[PDB]
Amino acid sequence: MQDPYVKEAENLKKYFNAGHSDVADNGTLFLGILKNWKEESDRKIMQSQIVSFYFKLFKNFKDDQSIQKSVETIKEDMNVKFFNSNKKKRDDFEKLTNYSVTDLNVQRKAIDELIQVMAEFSTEEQQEGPYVKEAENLKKYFNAGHSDVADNGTLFLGILKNWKEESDRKIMQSQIVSFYFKLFKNFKDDQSIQKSVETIKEDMNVKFFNSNKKKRDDFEKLTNYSVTDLNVQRKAIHELIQVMAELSQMLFRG
Amino acid sequence: MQDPYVKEAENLKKYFNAGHSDVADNGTLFLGILKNWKEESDRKIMQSQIVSFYFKLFKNFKDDQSIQKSVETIKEDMNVKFFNSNKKKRDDFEKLTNYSVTDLNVQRKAIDELIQVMAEFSTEEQQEGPYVKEAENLKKYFNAGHSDVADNGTLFLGILKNWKEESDRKIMQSQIVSFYFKLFKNFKDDQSIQKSVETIKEDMNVKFFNSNKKKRDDFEKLTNYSVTDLNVQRKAIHELIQVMAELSPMLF
């Protein structure tokens, strides 16, 4: 498509001076990584990250009067193109991108479902073996068996059952994986559990990316871009239009 | 002092269009809250937060070529004015603002030192009673009594000792309390420990702010501003100069 979003996206570009030089340097943020992937299931893994990225960015502009309107327009158009007008999807997505990685309850509930989430990645058949031993250690280290964690509603498993198409599952999985990696990163120092973490991490890296390293790299590269870096924001605003496409006297207003 | 940075701060103000209207609305971010406080000890509590805020904000500009230089200039000058050229201080401050609230290890080590941190709080007269029972529950719930938590030195205790002046201790305490409130926020839902948290949370609110509600509100109002909001950033860049002026001074 190409009609409403393009005008607003153009306004954004000038508001942040996204067309300058400083931003036209240091390679691209998203476009490049988007090219290395043609399979649809793949692009969704990357796109899911890029969309959640922009939504985070847009949320910082929601109050700016001069640009707000353009943002709501781009935001909704994106919402339609990406989720294909499926509200139930956009909802589960947002529900995933909004869980707090810090809430002690959420952390424990995540660790609980870890093993079943680990199983659901297998687009077909992908054994038990290793990880399960470590995932079991986690489940007890955090008491993820108690009624505090095993009470009402699930974090991931439920949202995961609502989606059978692969392309779809990838969108949700992309978020669930980036979530776990962010969680594991907080345990990296804890002696009692670190080993198990690396093991779970690595095994998850294999199952989800199908041992493809270039993919796991491009994935991590996306999840590590800082949403706060002024430079990153501008270069993001820059590429917005092209990203919307393949998804089918200084700065700030004079 | 008032000469170098002022030039840079002016650059900032224009780079972000901070003298516009949209930013000159919704009151003020810092200036207002800064006026409500004249005692030095108090202003430090507020300033500690305002400075940590600006440092967080400057960090997002470090790469921007057009404005970076100005930032380093303002950053340094601010470092001088606020800590009064005392490096050991600025270091301990930054060491405090940089601890990760998420690191499972840091959380546990913090929970351990909680009680002692609670003590050294009052300017002098301190007792027990209330919180201590809950803080104890905390220490066990997180196994903060284990031998491995009291490792690699201390998070707060150590830094709290290097400082005896009140004005100073506040700068460090402001951050330590904002840290614990952030940490406690991650426990609000945990049924088994929630209650104890509210108790410790409140009692801490009392001892640090001395039951002064307007103070606690202005503190929380500072800690909660989002560093990411484009509007807030721009408003903060505007008030930069004035703000610089008033600176002189079982689970596991």
User: What's the rounded Cα separation, in Å, for the pair A20 and A22?
Assistant: 6
CB A43, CB A34: distance < 8 Å: yes
Q: In whole angstroms, give the CA distance from residue A62 to residue A18.
A: 19
Instruction: Write the secondary structure of B103-145 as one string of H (helix), E (strand) and C (coil).
Output: CHHHHHHHHHHHHHHHHCCCCCCCCCCCCHHHHHHHHHHCCCC
B250 interfaces chain A, CB cutoff of 8 Å: yes
Instruction: Give CA–CA dist A145/A119, Å, rounded.
Output: 18
Tell me which chain A residues have a C-beta less than 8 angstroms from the C-beta of B65: 22
A interface mutation test: which of B191, B230, B234, B235 has the most A CBs within 10 A?
A: B230
How was it solved? X-ray
What CA–CA distance (Å, rounded) separates A196 from A191? 10
Among A198, A201, A178, which Cα is nearest to A190's? A198
The identity of residue B241, as a single letter, is I
Q: Smallest Cα–Cα separation from B239: which of B4, B12, B3?
A: B12
Tally of residues, chain B: 252
Which residues in chain B are contacts of A190 at CB distance < 8 A?
A: 104-105
Structure resolution in Å? 2.9
Residue pair B233/B16 in contact by the 8 Å Cβ criterion: yes
Q: What structural domains and CATH numbers belong to chain B?
A: 1-124 (1.20.1250.10), 129-252 (1.20.1250.10)
CA angle B42, B45, B46 (to 5 degrees): 95
Q: How far apart are CA B78 and CA B85, in angstroms?
A: 10
The encoded tokens of residue B34 equal 């800064």
Residue B68 near residue B62, CB atoms below 8 Å: yes
Does B55 lie at the interface with A, CB-CB under 8 angstroms? no
Residue ranges of the alpha helices (H) in chain A?
Answer: 4-15, 31-35, 40-61, 65-83, 87-97, 104-120, 132-141, 157-161, 166-187, 191-209, 213-224, 230-245
Q: How far is CA B190 from CA A71, B11, B19, B104, B193, in A?
A: 37, 47, 45, 16, 6
Q: CA A207, CA B200: separation in Å to the nearest integer? A: 44
- Asked whether the beta carbons of residue B15 and residue A251 sit closer than 8 angstroms, the reply is yes
**Please, which residues have CB within 8 angstroms of residue A127's CB and are 6 or more apart in sequence?**
none
Burial (CB < 10 A; 0-12, 13-18, 19+), residue B138, is buried
Q: Find the angle CA(A226)-CA(A227)-CA(A232) to the nearest 5 degrees.
A: 75
The interaxial angle of helices B191-209 and B104-119, nearest 10 deg, is 40
Contact A13, A233 (CB under 8 A): no
CB contact at 8 A, A92 and A159: yes
Q: CB of B183 within 8 A of CB of A103? A: no
d(CA B118, CA B138): 13
What is the rounded CA–CA span in Å between residue B15 and residue B67?
A: 8
Of A34, A182, A38, A162, residue with least CA distance to A90:
A162
Cα–Cα distances (Å) from B147 to A68, B112, B143, B151, B155, in that order, read: 53, 11, 9, 7, 15
Would you call B229 and A105 a contact, using CB atoms and an 8 Å cutoff?
no
Asked if residues A251 and A22 have their Cβ atoms less than 8 Å apart, the reply is: no
Tokens of A118: 């680990």
Token match 């995961």: residue? A160
